[PDB]
Amino acid sequence: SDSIIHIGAIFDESAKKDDEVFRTAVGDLNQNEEILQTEKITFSVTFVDGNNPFQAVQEACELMNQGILALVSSIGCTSAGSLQSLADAMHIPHLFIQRSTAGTPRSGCGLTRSNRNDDYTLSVRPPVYLHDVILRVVTEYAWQKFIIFYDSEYDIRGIQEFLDKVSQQGMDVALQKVENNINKMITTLFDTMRIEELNRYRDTLRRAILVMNPATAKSFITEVVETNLVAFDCHWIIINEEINDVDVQELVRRSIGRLTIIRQTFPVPQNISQRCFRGNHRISSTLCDPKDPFAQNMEISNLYIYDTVLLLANAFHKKLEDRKWHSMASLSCIRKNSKPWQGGRSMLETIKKGGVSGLTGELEFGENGGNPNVHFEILGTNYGGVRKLGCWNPVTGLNGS
């Protein structure tokens, strides 16, 4: 058929959970009699190879031909720019949820905003503040010498500013990529390196920062511990937006010195019953029950996807309620003659000025089209068990020790 409210979605082939949660969000909203009271949300989803930006563009174009009010994407940077540039050309509001590769910490995409042109892409996840946070924490601990370990997917441009600053303060900072198989890495090491090197190496590991996905960190921590490359006096920091409660418990278990864990956190209500509601809106218990295996295994992008669907629904609702609806249009991509959606500008403005309370806390956009809200918690344990040391956000800064 053909509904009044139609949205498109492009997901990486790895984003099965994004798709499930996207559909759950639509489902939840359709049960909500207070939002879109006489209109059901319909959607079209396409999975693409996120390393294939033409396929992303191709499939996105097909959705626009069907006719959509907005495009939700959950993809890496490789295809983001193609989609962003398409969205701008077609005036289709584009809600972009950045996914990182293999749980590696995020680094900025560097999506070139449109100066003379209007930018139709909204960045749903907050800016990457990893470099700011890690610097602040390192400064608090008065470190002067330490090693930064990063996994094989991480984009070190994410810490270029960090490296500049530590150098400027005269610190001694080593860099090493950690191969995805730790066992052969460390075995190789002992064979390859001689004694005096390993002694130098051991000393260097007394203070380290891990910029990697928790799975690789787990294996890495264990292997160094078991091989006596660290000792009780060591202090390691792990930083990643995405480290779930199960990962945190396991990291602590595996470590034998002091460990500091820095991860993103989401303001979620007290009284476990009200966790699954936002006002009159009921959220599927599978997403909000933190005893649920799904909930404990959700990727961060999954939470943002829920709030994105939530945000759009409220945007459409307000537009409908105000009796200022502009219909979707069937667009054509590869036609240098083809025109943009005449409804796009007003829809974009409405979505852009929208705000909802969801699983991530507050989702909204600033004047620059990006979500400003983000919070980091800082966990610790000296061994001999984990507790909250402090919190960080980009406006108030560090709180606690």
Q: Which is nearer to its own copies, 52 or 346 (CB)?
A: 52
Q: Which one, of 239, 236, 213, lies nearest residue 151 by Cα?
A: 213
Nearest approach, Cβ of residue 142 and its own copies (Å) = 17
CA atoms within 13 A on the CB side of 174: 16
Q: Residue 118, interface with its own copies (CB under 8 A)? A: no
Residues 346-375 that bind its own copies (CB under 8 A): none
Build a one-symbol-per-residue string for 77-116: x at contacts with its own copies by CB under 8 A, - elsewhere.
Answer: -x--xx--xx--x----------------------x----
Q: Residue 272, interface with its own copies (CB under 8 A)? A: no
| Pair 213, 151: CB distance under 8 Å | yes
Binding part of the chain for its own copies, among 59-67, 226-234, 280-288, 366-374 by CB under 8 A, reads 59-67
User: In which residue are the tokens 């930006």 written?
Assistant: 53
Q: Which one, of 324, 327, 314, 399, lies nearest residue 365 by Cα?
A: 314
Q: Residue 334, interface with its own copies (CB under 8 A)? A: yes
User: In which residue are the tokens 């595996």 written?
Assistant: 254
Nearest approach, Cβ of residue 163 and its own copies (Å) = 4
Residue of 7, 9, 57, 130 interacting with its own copies (CB under 8 A):
57
Q: Cα separation of 187 and 58, whole Å?
A: 46
Q: Residue 180, interface with its own copies (CB under 8 A)? A: no
Q: Cα separation of 368 and 125, whole Å?
A: 13
Residue of 13, 118, 172, 321 interacting with its own copies (CB under 8 A):
172
Residues near 298 by beta carbon (within 8 Å), at least 6 away in sequence: 17, 21, 244, 287
Residues 189-218 that bind its own copies (CB under 8 A): 197, 200
- Directed axis angle between helix 53-66 and helix 77-90, to 10°? 30
Q: Residue 164, interface with its own copies (CB under 8 A)? A: yes
Q: Which residues pair with 361 in a beta bridge?
A: 358
What is the binding site for its own copies (CB under 8 A)? Answer: 51-55, 57-59, 61-62, 78, 81-82, 85-86, 89, 112, 147, 155-157, 160, 163-164, 167-168, 170, 172, 174-177, 197, 200, 333-334, 336
